[PDB]
């Protein structure tokens, strides 16, 4: 009863039937990165199985290879998209600070527009990951600075209605 050959055969058959492939445009249109978490797990599903001695198929090995190469790039891209989405939600929820953060918004949108034409096979995909991180990094810092300053201005203007009626 303890033989696990059936489990390995079933898993290999399921993954082959899925026919997972990362090739395609790096983004698609909510913004998404065409790199699901599952493509990571298959690589690990090979990494342990090779230790267990099961002869994994060559195509599965190649898919694990592509997953391993593109996973850090996909994490950088999905982190950038998630940061942009949450920060955009924060900015939309507070319409007062929309004008100040206009430059970072148009910059990141322009970088995304440049990247729509890219593919996972593009050599320029890795330099774009470098480009997007810097611009998003600047956008986060300046937004953080304004929130500190804007609250102080909000408190100070709030002080005026209740402050003492003297010129000083």
């Amino acid at each position: 009863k303890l033989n696990t050959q059936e489990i390995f055969d079933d898993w290999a058959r399921k993954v082959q039937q899925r026919n997972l492939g990362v090739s395609g445009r790096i983004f698609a249109i909510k913004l998404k990165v065409n790199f699901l978490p599952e493509i990571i797990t298959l690589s690990k599903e090979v990494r342990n199985l090779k230790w267990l001695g099961f002869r994994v198929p060559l195509a599965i090995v190649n898919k694990a290879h592509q997953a391993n190469q593109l996973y850090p790039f996909a994490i950088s891209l999905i982190e950038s998209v998630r940061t942009y989405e949450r920060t955009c939600e924060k900015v939309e929820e507070r319409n007062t600070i929309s004008l100040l953060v206009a430059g970072l918004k148009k910059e990141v949108q322009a970088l995304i527009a440049e990247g729509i034409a890219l593919v996972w096979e593009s050599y320029k995909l890795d330099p774009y990951v470098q480009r997007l991180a810097e611009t998003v990094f600047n956008f986060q810092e300046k937004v953080d600075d304004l929130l500190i300053i804007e609250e102080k201005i909000d408190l100070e203007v709030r002080s005026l209605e209740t402050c003492v009626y003297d010129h000083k």
Binding site: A28, I29, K30, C88, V91, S98, L99, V101, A102, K106
Partner: peptide, 21 residues
Amino acid sequence: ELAAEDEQVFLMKQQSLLAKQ
């Protein structure tokens, strides 16, 4: 007044882009 595109309007634009492709 430059304003960030709403999620819905930006995604309708992206829908228009994807559909035509």
